[PDB]
Design a protein that fits this description.
part of a larger assembly; 3 chains; 155 residues; mainly alpha; two-stranded antiparallel ribbon; 55% helix; 2-methylcitrate dehydratase (chain A)
Amino acid sequence: PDYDAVLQDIADYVLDYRIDSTEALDTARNCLMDTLGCGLLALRFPECTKHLGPLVEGTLVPHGARVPGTSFRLDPVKAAWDIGCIVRWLDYNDTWLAAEWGHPSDNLGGILAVADHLSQKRLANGEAPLSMRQVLEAMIMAHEIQGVIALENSF
Amino acid sequence: RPDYDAVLQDIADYVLDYRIDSTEALDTARNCLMDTLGCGLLALRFPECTKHLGPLVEGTLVPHGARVPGTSFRLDPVKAAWDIGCIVRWLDYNDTWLAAEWGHPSDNLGGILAVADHLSQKRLANGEAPLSMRQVLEAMIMAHEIQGVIALENSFNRVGLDHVLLVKVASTAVCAKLMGADREQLLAALSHAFVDGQALRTYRHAPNAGSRKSWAAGDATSRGVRLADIALRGEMGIPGVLSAPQWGFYDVLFSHTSKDLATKPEDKRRFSFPQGYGSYVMENVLFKISFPAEFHAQTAAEAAVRLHPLVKDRLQRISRIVITTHESAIRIISKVGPLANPADRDHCLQYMTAVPLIFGDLVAEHYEDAFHAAHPLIDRLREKMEIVEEPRYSREYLEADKRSIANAVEVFFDDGSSTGQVAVEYPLGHRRRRAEGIPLLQEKFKANLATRFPPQRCQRIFDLCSHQASLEATPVNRFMDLLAI
Amino acid sequence: RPDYDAVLQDIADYVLDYRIDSTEALDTARNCLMDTLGCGLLALRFPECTKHLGPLVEGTLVPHGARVPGTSFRLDPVKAAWDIGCIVRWLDYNDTWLAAEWGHPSDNLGGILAVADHLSQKRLANGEAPLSMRQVLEAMIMAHEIQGVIALENSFNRVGLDHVLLVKVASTAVCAKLMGADREQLLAALSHAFVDGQALRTYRHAPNAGSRKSWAAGDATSRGVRLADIALRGEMGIPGVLSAPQWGFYDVLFSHTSKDLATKPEDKRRFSFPQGYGSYVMENVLFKISFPAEFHAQTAAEAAVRLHPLVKDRLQRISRIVITTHESAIRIISKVGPLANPADRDHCLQYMTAVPLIFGDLVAEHYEDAFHAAHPLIDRLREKMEIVEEPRYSREYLEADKRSIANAVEVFFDDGSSTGQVAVEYPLGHRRRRAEGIPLLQEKFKANLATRFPPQRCQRIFDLCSHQASLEATPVNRFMDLLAI
């Protein structure tokens, strides 16, 4: 059996869509800023900070992903947990009101940890690293997938 | 803000206060540990399995990291639990609990082993004493009990959820205990396991079946570790997670039947229990030590091996074969027609009774496609089989006293006579044949050790697992050192 | 203080100055690389092999460490070369050179890959370009040539020494080249390989044979890496290591035959050569791609599978089987009488001729005492087998334009009739059948890859190894990335 159509449409958009919107790229930049400042503010709150860091103190991850405002250096899965945790902790980040409510800047967690770790690994292999343009584009796509499914489907 | 729902309090007070006093529970816990580890070493021969194992970032150094049996990995306990529970379930040779829900409680060994290994290395480095394999075995018993007892009357198959959420629930509780949780931390943890997403079981059913059927359990026991660790970091719990109207587990996930979308009756919209938590599940667990066959047909095949020398001579002159069986076996494994893959012969009671009648044994190569074609007699004997339902066999299947999987076979020749009806009520992995099974289970263990370790090492490993008192006193870290690589 | 012995200078000037542009050499080296790596991956299923692998101290971290294919190990290049050489040789499925000395030049890939992987990574970490796989192919060709050309006319088993010293010398040479050695450092490195100790071959001969016959080569290419590294650290050389009176290699180790402790005539107390170094060995190398049998019997087993449909149902009418063969097969694998283990059957021409004559095939399963006993026709036919030397076959076995390995089989019946004589002079893994052999070599690589990697990784590896120009331009570190875990 073939994949359900919904999954085909997400995949074809993700792999084939060329972003041509100067406004989407400029807003994604301001969204990066806003979301990151939100994450930095959350580090004043111990109920948030008690979740951050490595599962085992003293773990060393080669080319580990960083968490903004901290000294942590982790695998992307945990770094993404921490980053998404701090930028959403105080409920100040961006919002999408539709059939389903949400905060699509939450995906910056997975985006930033994976881009940071991958960039370091490409540098160590002599290749060029990822540019922030590729995170701005990945935020536009993550916003799009979450927010468009949100238009008429309420969970 | 309510108290924690009564189901959670019950799990938490068993886990914290129950004192295990069953020599038999501790003895089959040891046998289960042997059998489960041997299934995991075996799985290291399969690339589809090993592609999941190891650190998420190559070269990761983890102080006092958890070991994965048969590998050189050293991980945090969350990924080590993923890996250990992955391999021990991959080939579906580990222990089985047949109830309202089906499951494999030895799956919870992923979380137990990983957390105990890492905690023991850490306390040893602090000048404290390590944990003992005795504490692993008791964790095994309690996890079996939580998963098996909920399984007794509550079916998640019928609400379209996979059984791995009982792995998650049990692993959370028993890993929170090993980590030192007080009652309030343990309750928070359980509550997060029930608020968590619960996997569908789409990957167990054609035409979408896939290898996730083989690692769902490692993934859930891993998530138990992580959720336990969140509770030990002090995260608040969710007291009404089951009972809350509109938002609670019961209303959202346990109130509708999957086959028809029908709402369940209001009284059936809750977990029901026929007994409390003890050590019943481990004492009564089923081991896969006999012929490779579906469990409802194991006694049938054993009967067909006893009847083999009698009907070896007069195979051609056969007119009728009666297989007296129990109800569940009829619904589940009685198939009439053709079987165009080994998975169909796997679940055909008539096929698993026919082949051992003809040849005197049932091995993995009897289910092969080409082996079927080469023997037309197999299909001819299946035609002459009629499946009779004994009303005591079926009621004794559901009896807590007995938990039988009984089958009787008798073949009538065309001349008018027949072999006596040979009835086997208890398969070789059952509680009631444990004396006879333990040799088989040890043989299977030693075969599985030999696929990963050299002779010297295999003997040292089996020697340690042979001896209850010596094994129980062994530091968990010194046990894991012996199982590494 | 003399110059270096001329043999050493000839090896060095070849290693430093000879340019490799032979299209066929480079294509067969790429097939050699596939076949060797797939052999090693298969060995990871064998604990007697894997018990030797990994760091000497568990948990050691090596920055820019060399990788062992199919494992998660990251080692220094000396231990890495040991493990790679150990695994690719373990099952005796890798390539072969039959001459005055027999050997498996692909054993040197252990030293080549480990050095080239480590050095690419270290060079990347200092902003230097890494090594390319083109360089490992060229190092293989040179290592094949140094070993296989010395083996043309110099027999070391006749002096009672293992042939593995030729692995040490060749691996020393090409690893010193890869490490950047100049002529004086390469000469010193070569001189330390000859002055070094040269293993006996006790472990290859009953009643003392054992599993060091499988890892002697890995041990020798590892030692070559170590001596190359000693030379690059600037250690002075030993110029008359071979020809020094009393203390030199010639007088001490190449001066006596070990059959009779008899001294050689003076003119034969040194190495002899029929040609210089080029790309001859790799172009004419032998692959094991057909039946799993000793090389002297592969054309015998082939000539029998041909004869199988003509006899498949007249087995009790066979009265005389004539096997026309060459002098080396008679001497090494012609055995009458009982065969104790599979090793006997593995090295018994009559067995490897009788089984295919009966079952149209030959696989490892046939070397099983269980299969042997199950069919008494093997020995009935073995007792009917007349072995005859063909003078031509023995001559063409030796001639450098042919390197035949020839077996003609003829089957006679009790009524006086016969099949023809089926002659196969060249096995499938021979240069003269490259066209047909390469399909089989590639399928053999694909199967072996699949015992270790899941399907998409298997596809990436096969696809990359398939394209000469693409593989050649691949950095060694990135090639080794694909083979980890």
